[PDB]
Amino acid sequence: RNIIADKYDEASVLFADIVVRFLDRLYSAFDELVDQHGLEKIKVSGDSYMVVSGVPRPRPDHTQALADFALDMTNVAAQLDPRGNVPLRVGLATGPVVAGVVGSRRFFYDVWGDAVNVASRMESTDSVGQIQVPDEVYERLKDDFVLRERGHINVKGVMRTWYLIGRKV
């Protein structure tokens, strides 16, 4: 009741692993590749890379479409590392799969109110480089913080706003 699942008698699957800054560099190029070849990257846990061909969108040439992808992928991994040293393992199969959507559930903290609205509008009308604030936060900071007025903006009425310069040292 939480999974929509569809059988595919034949698709093509690719797993890669290479296998902080370095990882993200490669993977961007792989993502670009996936988009170039018009293929589908599947989210998987723990640093391994997975691309599918023929799913969700069937392709008469699904295996070879993937094979071509794999060949580019090695040519990118090839160079493009740390010192002079990228070790990429890549695996391909073609056969039946099941594909579809998993209905997981998450729990997040969230906040609502006028303060959220006021904060939103303070950001989106802020002057670049500044921290913009209403009267209410000004009142709370004036003693310990130094602030300079901006003036009266229409906030989707009319409010006075201040820039927050810094602490008082």
Numbering used by the authors: 240 to 258, 273 to 333, 335 to 339, 341 to 411, 414 to 426
Quote the passages of the study that discuss this structure, keeping the authors' original sentences.
Two subunits (A and B) were obtained in the asymmetric unit with extensive domain swapping. Clear electron density is observed for residues 240–426 of chain A (except for the β1–α2, α3–β4 and β7–β8 loops) and for residues 240–428 of chain B (except for the β1–α2 and β7–β8 loops). In general small regions are involved in domain swapping, but in this case about half of the residues (β5–α4–β6–α5–β7–β8) are swapped between the subunits, leading to a large number of interactions between the subunits. The intact substrate-binding pockets at the active dimer interface are not formed in the swapped dimer. Metal ions and the substrate analogue cordycepin added during crystallization were not seen in the structure because of the altered domain arrangement that is not conducive for binding ligands. In the case of Rv1625c-Wt the dimerization-arm loop (β4–β5 loop) opened up and exchanges the part of the molecule consisting of the β5–α4–β6–α5–β7–β8 structural elements with the other subunit. Consequently, a new open interface is formed between the α2 helices of each subunit.
Adenylyl cyclases convert ATP to cyclic AMP, and these enzymes are classified into six types based on their sequence similarity. In solution Rv1625c exists predominantly as a monomer, with a small amount of dimer.
